[PDB]
């Protein structure tokens, strides 16, 4: 599923990301745009044999199990397929495990380089939330 911005903002709000570890909602919407272009089915193969899955491009070495990645840790204790659902619940729950404190969104290099410090309020404006 390809979300629109306001549709994704509403879903991320529904799943409790607003102010999660102190990060206002627009941070997560911004991160999703840069990571996946709002596409829940986004996948990216990495040279290290892992793959990034879903709307937040969560990695199969550290976070989810895809059964083909050497050195799997599976810290979210989830099959990576759950991260390709049209329902963002599993991606949100894994993102919540990745972000364990107020610097955890550094888990996304694109968020650090393109969202942090910007007007994240704009990402949730106009959405009738």
């Amino acid at each position: 599923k390809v979300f629109g911005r306001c549709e994704l903002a509403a879903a991320m709000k529904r799943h409790g990301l607003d102010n999660y570890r102190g990060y206002s909602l627009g941070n997560w919407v911004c991160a999703a745009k840069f990571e996946s272009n709002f596409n829940t089915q986004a996948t990216n193969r990495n040279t290290d044999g892992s793959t990034d899955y879903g709307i937040l491009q969560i990695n199969s070495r550290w976070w989810c199990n895809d059964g083909r990645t050497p050195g799997s840790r599976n810290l979210c204790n989830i099959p990576c397929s759950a991260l390709l659902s049209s329902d963002i619940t599993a991606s949100v729950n894994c993102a919540k495990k990745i972000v364990s404190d107020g610097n955890g969104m550094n888990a996304w290099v694109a968020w650090r380089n393109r969202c942090k410090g910007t007007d994240v309020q704009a990402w949730i404006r106009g959405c009738r939330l």
Binding site: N37, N39, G126
Partner: protein
Amino acid sequence: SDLGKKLLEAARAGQDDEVRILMANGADVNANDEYGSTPLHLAALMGHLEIVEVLLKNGADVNAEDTVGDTPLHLAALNGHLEIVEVLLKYGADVNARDSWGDTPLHLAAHMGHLEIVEVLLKNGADVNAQDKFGKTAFDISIDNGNEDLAEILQKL
């Protein structure tokens, strides 16, 4: 190297006077960070109009692409910085540049509902029918987000 790193940091941070001294002292106006950002990308991203102009007057590369193909115009359009959008276009920015995701600046402005920027891009030759990676035009994006005002602009084009 040293000064280029400091220039990138000063441009991102909006440190106009530090940008000025670093340029006077020989910093590379097109220094890259690990993400492939130049100082112009970072000043455009963060809305620092005066730094954008200083960089451009020192020969900044107006169409530099970062590691994901975004140009300074992409970042300024997404972040609602109208005056920066105008100066970048004045200095030769490609109004129809496609990043690696397949977005043009018009797509990015439409996602965010930046009405005035949409109008500037169109006036400067943006392709109103350009489709993103998923076949969406700016109009489709505006309908997606229930943005009546933006839809009204693009519907008649």
